[PDB]
Amino acid sequence: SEAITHGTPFQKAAALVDLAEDGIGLPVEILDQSSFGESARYYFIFTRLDLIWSLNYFALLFLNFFEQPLWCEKNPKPSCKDRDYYYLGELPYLTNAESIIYEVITLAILLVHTFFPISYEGSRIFWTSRLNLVKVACVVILFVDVLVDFLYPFRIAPYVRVIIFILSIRELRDTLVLLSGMLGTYLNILALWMLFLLFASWIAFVMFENTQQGLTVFTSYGATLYQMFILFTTSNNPDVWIPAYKSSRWSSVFFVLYVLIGVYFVTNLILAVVYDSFKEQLAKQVSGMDQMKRRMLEKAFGLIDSDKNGEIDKNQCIKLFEQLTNYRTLPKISKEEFGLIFDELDDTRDFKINKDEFADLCQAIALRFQKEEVPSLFEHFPQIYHSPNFGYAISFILIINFIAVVVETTLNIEESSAQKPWQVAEFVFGWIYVLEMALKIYTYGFENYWREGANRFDFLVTWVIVIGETATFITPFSNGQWIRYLLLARMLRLIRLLMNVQRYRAFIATFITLIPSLMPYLGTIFCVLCIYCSIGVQVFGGLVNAGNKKLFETELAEDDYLLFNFNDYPNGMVTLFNLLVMGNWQVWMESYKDLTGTWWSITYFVSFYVITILLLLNLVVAFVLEAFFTELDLEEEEKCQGQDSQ
Amino acid sequence: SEAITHGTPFQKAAALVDLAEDGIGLPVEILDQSSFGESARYYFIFTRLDLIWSLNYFALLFLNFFEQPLWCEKNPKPSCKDRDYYYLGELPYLTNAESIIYEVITLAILLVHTFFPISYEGSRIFWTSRLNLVKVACVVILFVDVLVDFLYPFRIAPYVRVIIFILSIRELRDTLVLLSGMLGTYLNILALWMLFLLFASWIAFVMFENTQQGLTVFTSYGATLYQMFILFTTSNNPDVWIPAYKSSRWSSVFFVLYVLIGVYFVTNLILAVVYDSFKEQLAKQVSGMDQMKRRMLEKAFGLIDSDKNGEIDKNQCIKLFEQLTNYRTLPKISKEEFGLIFDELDDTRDFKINKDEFADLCQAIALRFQKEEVPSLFEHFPQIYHSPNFGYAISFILIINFIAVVVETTLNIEESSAQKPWQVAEFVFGWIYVLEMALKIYTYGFENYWREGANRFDFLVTWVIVIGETATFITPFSNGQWIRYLLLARMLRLIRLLMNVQRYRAFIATFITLIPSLMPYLGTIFCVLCIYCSIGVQVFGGLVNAGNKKLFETELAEDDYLLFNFNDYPNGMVTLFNLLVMGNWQVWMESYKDLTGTWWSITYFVSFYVITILLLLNLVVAFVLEAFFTELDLEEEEKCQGQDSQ
Ligand SMILES: CCCCCCCCCCCCC[C@@H]1[C@@H](C(=O)O)[C@@]1(CCCCCCCCCCCC)CCC(=O)O
Ligand SMILES: CCCCCC[C@@]12[C@@H](CCCC)[C@@]1(CCCCCCCCCC(=O)O)[C@@H]2CCCCCCCC(=O)O
Ligand SMILES: CCCCCCCCCCCCCCCC(=O)O
Ligand SMILES: CCCCCCCCCCCCCCCC(=O)O
Ligand SMILES: CCCCCCCCCCCCCCCC(=O)O
Ligand SMILES: CCCCCCCCCCCCCCCC(=O)O
Ligand SMILES: CCCCCCCCCCCCCCCC(=O)O
Ligand SMILES: CCCCCCCCCCCCCCCC(=O)O
Ligand SMILES: CCCCCCCCCCCCCCCC(=O)O
Ligand SMILES: CCCCCCCCCCCCCCCC(=O)O
Ligand SMILES: CCCCCCCCCCCCCCCC(=O)O
Ligand SMILES: CCCCCCCCCCCCCCCC(=O)O
Ligand SMILES: CCCCCCCCCCCCCCCC(=O)O
Ligand SMILES: CCCCCCCCCCCCCCCC(=O)O
Ligand SMILES: [Ca+2]
Ligand SMILES: [Ca+2]
Ligand SMILES: [Ca+2]
Ligand SMILES: [Ca+2]
Ligand SMILES: [Ca+2]
Incomplete structure (x- = not known):
């Protein structure tokens, strides 16, 4: 249990194991802090000062993010019968004087959080890093819209709050690299997706024109691309082609051929691409992670090799392992550590330690031991520690x-x-x-x-x-x-x-790891809904009224989904969830095509679907297949390499 | 373009390349024919005589199979108003005199087809191999039902016809090994699946007893396991938990948590197991295929090594390549073929050819060349062949x-x-x-x-x-x-x-391969429906009548699915298809629970689902992920390996 305030005494002996700490749990430090500057230089103190207020920051990030349910509708005041609930939500909507307080407190922490890297990056560097330049400008936009309610076109505050919440978190940004690094492959395959819609939408319009089908459903050609898209999702399966089937029974051979190609061949092949394109992007993040490791070990290898020759005496590196506080007795462990890596150099048996050799060393040790066991710093003046x-x-x-x-x-x-x-x-x-x-x-x-x-x-x-x-x-x-x-x-x-049962054993450790690993990758999709809701609240605000006459004809009144409704934000978040799950998602598409009276409402649900059945096939379904094969082969090798390592 | 009637002249020189033909296209021959017996012994003649009538046999196998739509209902004659159509099918049902003509002609080919391996297997061997002992007994069961014509419990003919159709085809049997070899893993994970229904069914019964929900839907506990199973499929998503949501808005945080675990975590992890358990079973079929190759090459290596020493002079194996009709300029590349395939033994440069070495030879040649080019042999007496x-x-x-x-x-x-x-x-x-x-x-x-x-x-x-x-x-x-x-x-x-376009290159090169590769694995599922239909026709025969009063209350009359009916065979095959696709599959489960008035109707649709969402996750979705990675890496390698393959 050594110190953490440790790169500030910063000996060649001392400051090593703090860097060796930085390889094991693997936190990054900034390249400004990686190049030079120490806790003696009063910049690296502010680095670890940042990680003190981390839980302060994530307490703020969800505080900012959860304002979007609590803020009101887009149109409370233009709307008549405002205080009544004609299928509106549950939450209290915050008053404008109360609205200011929860934001000014929110922004001031951001103004700390955004400008805290001034304390350990130079201003001509901080404004150069082009990641902050997005994030700094987003603060200005809230600073405007706070000032507007302080002064008391469609109030574009809440889209930014998501983008602030996405970028600030290290995990969600690491997710978001895997989108833009892969999005050239997804929109690529979206074409050949759209092609085998449009071609197969066309033939149904070709075949079924003169019959009862084109009379009933397939009126336009654009009626078919509308319908046959829903049958690509199969959430409306027999209702489409009943009057094609009721007239001629042999017309079933079309549709049962279409859905096979539709679901079973294409949608898997969409998943085949996105899971395969996931592997390359995940490899780039892992190799982007491992270049951080060696570049941090280069600072560690340079901290010891003060003779600058690239070779370090072994007793110089053995002696710091007690300062590492890893193992207790150290008489001949490092002699055993030679054969644990692939080859010994043995030009000198001990005297020569190369640059890549020590980079393999500290990477190897924490796997076998896990013996650092560092607790949180306590005050000994209470001394509350009480001493199958x-x-x-x-x-x-x-x-x-x-x-x-x-x-x-x-x-x-x-x-x-x-x-x-x-x-x-x-x-x-x-x-x-x-x-x-x-x-x-x-x-x-x-x-x-x-x-x-x-x-x-x-x-x-x-x-x-x-x-x-x-x-x-x-x-x-x-x-x-x-x-x-x-x-x-x-x-x-x-x-x-x-879950110590060996019969279930591979299925055990995945679902364990499935909660922490898929927390960003489901977290991003939760942010995606916060985009699509805040669009739809502004597009579809007071649309489902109490006495709307276009309403009662439609499917929301038939199946009585006269809830979710989009009529404010937390009503919307449930409503996009059903469109996420694909449980009867064509009701809303059929409804808001009538409640807006236009066909540009269909844009909102298809644009959801394409980004959704990217992201569901992207990060839900492609991870589980990656996560299982992680947990499977470890069990397959722990017995086999346990015959080796013993 | 040599002969195929070739193991009947049967020289050590000649009959080699017929065996070398048997490695390239890879057809099996029987182990009785593999051990001994030749075209001089006439048994090998009946082997190739069998493959003449192959298209005769597959013309029969679909002829037998398609009788099941054309045969009538289980109860034509007990039913009143028989000749009328109350939501019945289109097909003409075959009259009993015309029926037997289609069956006796069918069986007589089977009696040829089943007893044709008498001609090249011994009778004390033919009745021993226990594939036949299933298949011979299945013929007897149909032979009973022809006697039932002269007599004019529930006529269990059509289940057997499927089983005859499954086993006879070499592909579907090769599929069916991958079921029973893996079914111990699927039912293993079905229990841990069933646990996280029951526990999650239980809490929803615990949570919602006193509220409006248990008053309305969740009356029994068994009402919940019924409902929450459907929400595991999510084909009834908001309709379940509206009155839980309409009462308290916070009840959504249950259901949106359940489906995430339900669909996004479990159903992928069911697919993660079945796709992983697929790989081991597919490896067993491939290694079971490759043991056939070397064991057929052992007969080929023994056909040449008449000195029985295990080493063959190269000129003995060079000379047969012209009899192989493979390539023109032979002696210049046969020294290069030492260098191309693997490493040379070079104890003697040419004189010593080992057992495994020749097994490496004939295996590698057909990859690079494809120069055998065997046509259909014509009569030259017309000579109709006319000589980017x-x-x-x-x-x-x-x-x-x-x-x-x-x-x-x-x-x-x-x-x-x-x-x-x-x-x-x-x-x-x-x-x-x-x-x-x-x-x-x-x-x-x-x-x-x-x-x-x-x-x-x-x-x-x-x-x-x-x-x-x-x-x-x-x-x-x-x-x-x-x-x-x-x-x-x-x-x-x-x-x-x-799709010579490199942007789309890998994707449809899969889709080209996807039609022949998934013809058995979709063919078996088409046989699975022919089981479940012939059950449901016999269970649910005259149930949806013209004037059934329990009918019009239910959902098939609400959404007007009064087709998709089970009231004969081809109405069933459409109807099981909708239960395959999962488009609104809970309508029929809700309907036939009422039209039988019992809860043992729910057995039929769940037992569909478990076997289906094995087989859809088994052989549809696991192949496309395997088939794409076959097509993807070949594009990734051949650009780099073509610099080495030259
Ligand atoms: C994949 C998502 C992981 C992140 C977990 C979500 C954290 C945010 C929690 C939202 C809490 C809102 C609850 C609302 C009820 C309340 O008591 O306040 C209430 C809103 C209904 C549920 C909201 C959840 C919808 C979004 C979750 C599903 C999408 C994620 C994929 C009604 C208000 C009231 O009357 O009290
Ligand atoms: C994958 C899975 C499968 C499913 C199955 C279903 C179906 C399809 C096929 C596809 C490919 C494989 C089918 C066929 C056809 C259909 C049709 C029906 C109707 C009937 C009508 C009659 C009259 O005419 O009236 C199946 C179903 C059924 C079958 C049938 C056949 C024939 C038909 C006709 O005849 O048309
Ligand atoms: C694979 C492509 C096949 C067809 C795709 C292109 C069709 C585009 C529009 C079709 C014509 C629409 C017919 C009705 C329009 C009208 O009468 O004004
Ligand atoms: C990506 C492929 C399709 C995506 C969204 C499908 C929308 C196409 C359906 C056309 C809308 C209705 C046709 C217009 C006819 C009219 O206005 O009279
Ligand atoms: C973002 C690109 C997607 C494009 C969206 C669909 C492209 C074609 C639009 C369909 C309209 C065709 C209807 C023509 C027939 C008619 O109106 O009578
Ligand atoms: C986080 C980036 C946002 C992505 C796109 C956001 C803005 C696109 C559309 C915004 C409002 C569109 C609504 C137009 C119709 C209307 O306002 O009545
Ligand atoms: C991937 C983006 C989704 C594409 C959205 C397709 C938009 C098509 C909407 C219907 C097309 C007909 C336009 C006429 C508008 C109208 O009738 O008022
Ligand atoms: C996270 C990025 C998602 C942004 C993409 C979604 C925006 C596409 C369409 C939004 C609404 C457009 C349709 C509204 C038509 C109208 O004004 O009536
Ligand atoms: C994980 C398991 C939790 C509970 C599972 C076992 C419950 C089995 C049956 C529950 C009791 C049914 C309540 C009504 C029965 C009755 O009184 O007749
Ligand atoms: C594999 C888990 C579930 C599989 C099938 C679910 C069926 C369970 C539902 C119980 C049926 C209704 C309860 C009986 C009560 C009654 O007789 O009224
Ligand atoms: C083949 C094994 C599957 C087992 C099928 C379900 C096991 C439990 C059956 C559910 C009945 C529970 C209902 C009890 C409560 C009640 O009836 O009041
Ligand atoms: C190919 C193997 C068949 C698998 C199981 C087949 C027989 C199981 C049930 C057959 C009939 C069951 C119907 C019982 C009720 C009734 O006949 O009224
Ligand atoms: C995997 C096999 C599926 C299991 C099928 C579950 C059968 C449960 C049916 C309802 C249970 C209650 C039994 C009472 C019968 C009745 O009410 O007539
Ligand atoms: C290919 C193998 C599938 C066989 C499994 C399916 C048989 C399970 C149940 C069949 C019907 C049972 C319910 C009928 C109840 C009744 O007689 O009313
Ligand atoms: Ca040194
Ligand atoms: Ca040494
Ligand atoms: Ca309805
Ligand atoms: Ca020899
Ligand atoms: Ca040689």
Whole structure:
């Protein structure tokens, strides 16, 4: 547990292992900080000062981002019957005086966050870096629209807030490289997609003109490209070609041939491209990540080789491993570390250490050990640190804790009003579970809240139990059953302890890693909806009124989806989700073609679909196939290389 | 172009290249024929006699298979108002006298086809190989049903006909190995799938008991596992959780979390397993194919090495290459073939040829050359054989022929009754197209009807044109309209020729390969429907009547799907197709739960789904990802490897 304020004493001995820390967890530092400048030079202090306020910044980034539900409609005041809810949302819309407060607080942190790299980049460099120049200008745009409501065309604030939220996060920008690096391949294949629509849209207009079909549905040619596009999605499958089938039965041979080519041949081949084009772009990000590693190791190799000859004595590099605080006794480990990499140079047995050799060294060590084990810095003035047989024992606990609920809920079909003997069993079970995590700080380590992936995900849920049980009878109702389903992620911990089964073993570790790995790649799509909603709120604001007469003819009134409606922002975010899932997405396309009365409404849903069935095929479906083959072959090699490494 | 009747002269010199032919196109021969027995022993004659009647057999296998639409309903005669059509099909159902004519002729070929391996396998061997023991017994079951004609429980004929059709074809059996070799992995993951239905079905029953939701939809717990299964398919997405959403808006955060786990995380991970389990089973079929190759080369290496020492002089193997009819200037490249394929042994420069070395020889030759070029052998007594500048030229030919069609159809929106100057342009264009294939027999070769993949697919449509134009004015109406509509495979010939474009190069080189590669793997699924139809015809025969009162309440009458009906066989095959595509598949599950009045109807559609979303994820979607990476890397390698392949 060495220091982190460590590139500021900055010895050749000392400042190495901070750089060696920077390879293992792999955080970047700026190329301005990578070239020169130290914590003695009062710039690298501000680098680690930035990472102190990181949780301050991400608290702001979602604070800015979640304003978009809470801000009002595009047209509250032009609209009549404004305060009523004619199928509007739930949220309170913030008043204009309240609107200012939540933004001025928001902007001032951005003005810190955007101009904090002045403290460790030069102003003639900071304004040159051409990534900030986007982000700086986005701040100015909010600074305008705050001033407009301070002074009190269509208020283009919320599009920018997304773009601020996309770029600021390191993960979403790293996602966003994989779009623009690959988007030349997707729009490429979008043509040959559109070709086998237009050709196959045409033949149905050719074949079915004089029959009942062209009389009924396929009136225009443009009626077909409209319809046959929906059948490319197959979310309207038999309703299209009933009167083609009802007239002649042999007309089915067309449509069942079309969808086969449509779904089963093309849409997979769209996925075949995008998953294949993913691999090249992912390789460019990985190699772009690994060039960061060697370029940071070049600063590390130059920090030691002060003779500047490119060869370092071994005792010069052995001695820093205790300062590395990696392993405890070091008599002959580095002699073993020669054969662990491919070849020994052995021109001198110890004296010659080449540039690429040490770059292989620090990269190798953290894989085998994971022994750095660094906790957070504590004050010793309190000193609060208190100084599968058990696995099969805790296999039994979450069994009987689970069946306690199903007994409680088969009491609820009996509807016991006398829960007095059953409330004896209620409060006791939450008191139990805090004891099975207790041996871990007795056996191995204290700060493993951030270590086990279960403690990454259950740590709220582990501690939320008895604090919910506390205000049960001391509050002397709706929040009472709020716990009564919350006491069920016990099975989710029972999942992982059942997930030691070797029969499920590859499928286990993917779905574990599937939550952290696909958090940016689903995070970007959540930002994409925040674009499409804020378009559609402004396009379709007060459109579905209370008494709109074009409404009740259409499909939203037939199937009674007279909710989601786009009539403000959080109503829109649900509505784009159904268009994401493709559950009956042609209702809205059929509805807003009538509620706007125009065919330029069809633009909004197709432009969703193309970018969606890029992004669903891009980052959902192509990752899982990459993520499984990561988790599969490790299990396939851990037995085989465990025969080697032992 | 030597003979094929060639292992019956059966020289050590001669009968080699017939075995060398058997490696190149790779047909199997039986292990009885592989062990011993020759065309002198007459058994090898019956082997090639079998492959003469191959097209006779596949003409029978679809003849037997297509009786199942043409055979009648399960209950014509118990049903009242039998001859009327109350949402029944189109086909004429075969009369019982005319039925047996189509069956006795069918069976007599099977009795040839099943007992033809008597002629080249011993009877104590033929009844031992346990493929036949299935297949012979299936013949007996049909032989029963012909006796049932003279008598005039539920007539289980048509299930067997599929099983006969599956096993007889070599491709579908090779598909069917990949099921049973992998089905232990799929049902393995089906349980862990079923768990994250049940648990996620459970919480929605837990959450929504006291609210409006459990009052309205989620009445039973079994009501939820019913509903939440449909939302795993998302073919009923907002209709489920409207009254959960209409009451509390926060209930959406459940459902949008469920489908993400449901579709985007699980269903890909089901596809991740099945595509990964595909690779191992496909490797077993490939290695099972390649063991056939070396074991056939062992008979070839033993045919030459008559000294039985395992080493063959090169002039013994040089001399047969002219009998192979492979290449013209032989002795200059046979020394280069030492250097091209692999490394030379060079203990003797030519004298020593090992067992595995010759196995490397004949394997590599057919790749580089393709110079065997075997035609269909003619009688010379008639002697009917008559003894990209052009590519950019025939690029232009279809274009002006294509725009002639769209001019003809924009005449039809004008509706010209005077087609007399326009019929000058009609008949002339079909006469043109037979001339662009004509240089191929002048430049390169005659029998390339089976060689170019375009001539594999266009050859019916290439020649159908002028014979459709012939009976236009000499018949002095509805049929010649469709021929006017048929004038469109020209752009389908443009599809192949245009993808010399490197921008689209890999994509349709897949799609070319995609039709023959996925012909068995879609063929099996077509057989799977012929199982599920013949179940559902017998289960649901006269159910959707004319005046059924339970019918008009349900969804098939609401959305007017009163076709797609199950009330005979070909209504079923359309109907299972919609359940295959997943276009509104919950209508039938909602309908036949009412029209049978029972909950055991739900079995039929779920058991469809699990086997289907095996087989769609199995053999559609896993192939295209395998097939693209076959087509992609060959384009990626040949540009670099052609500098080495030279
Ligand atoms: C893939 C997405 C990962 C990111 C997770 C989303 C974080 C943002 C959370 C949104 C919370 C809004 C809840 C709204 C209810 C409330 O109680 O306030 C409410 C809005 C309905 C649900 C909103 C979620 C829609 C977007 C999620 C799905 C898209 C992501 C792909 C109604 C307001 C009320 O009356 O209380
Ligand atoms: C992949 C999967 C498959 C599915 C199947 C379905 C269908 C298709 C085929 C495609 C290719 C493979 C089919 C065929 C055809 C159709 C049609 C139907 C109708 C009937 C009508 C009759 C009269 O005429 O009336 C299948 C379905 C069925 C079959 C049938 C055949 C024949 C027909 C006619 O006849 O038309
Ligand atoms: C593969 C391309 C085939 C056809 C694609 C081009 C067709 C473009 C427009 C077709 C004509 C529309 C017919 C009605 C228009 C009108 O009468 O004004
Ligand atoms: C990418 C291919 C298609 C994308 C979107 C499909 C929209 C094409 C359908 C045409 C709209 C209706 C035709 C206009 C006829 C009219 O206005 O009278
Ligand atoms: C962004 C590019 C996509 C282009 C969108 C579709 C291109 C063609 C538009 C379809 C209109 C054809 C309708 C003509 C027939 C008619 O109006 O009567
Ligand atoms: C984050 C980049 C945004 C991408 C495109 C945003 C702006 C495109 C269209 C904006 C408003 C379009 C609506 C026009 C019709 C109307 O306002 O009534
Ligand atoms: C990929 C971008 C999607 C392309 C959107 C297609 C737009 C076509 C809209 C209908 C076409 C007919 C235009 C006439 C407009 C009108 O009738 O008012
Ligand atoms: C994240 C980038 C997405 C931007 C692309 C979506 C914008 C395309 C169309 C938006 C609405 C256009 C149709 C509105 C017509 C109208 O004004 O009535
Ligand atoms: C992960 C599992 C959670 C629960 C799964 C087991 C539930 C099986 C049946 C639940 C009880 C059904 C309630 C009504 C039955 C009745 O009273 O007849
Ligand atoms: C593979 C998981 C589910 C598969 C099929 C889902 C069927 C479960 C739904 C239960 C049916 C209705 C409940 C019975 C109650 C009753 O008899 O009224
Ligand atoms: C082939 C195995 C699949 C098993 C099919 C589903 C297993 C459970 C069946 C659901 C019935 C539960 C309904 C109980 C509640 C009630 O009826 O009141
Ligand atoms: C090819 C193998 C067939 C697989 C299973 C076939 C037989 C299973 C069920 C057959 C009939 C089931 C219908 C029972 C109810 C009824 O006949 O009324
Ligand atoms: C994988 C196989 C599919 C499993 C099929 C689930 C069958 C459940 C059917 C409903 C369960 C309730 C049984 C009561 C029958 C009845 O109400 O008549
Ligand atoms: C190719 C193999 C598929 C066989 C599996 C399908 C058979 C499962 C259920 C068939 C029908 C069962 C439900 C009928 C109930 C009834 O008799 O009313
Ligand atoms: Ca040195
Ligand atoms: Ca050494
Ligand atoms: Ca309806
Ligand atoms: Ca020899
Ligand atoms: Ca030699």
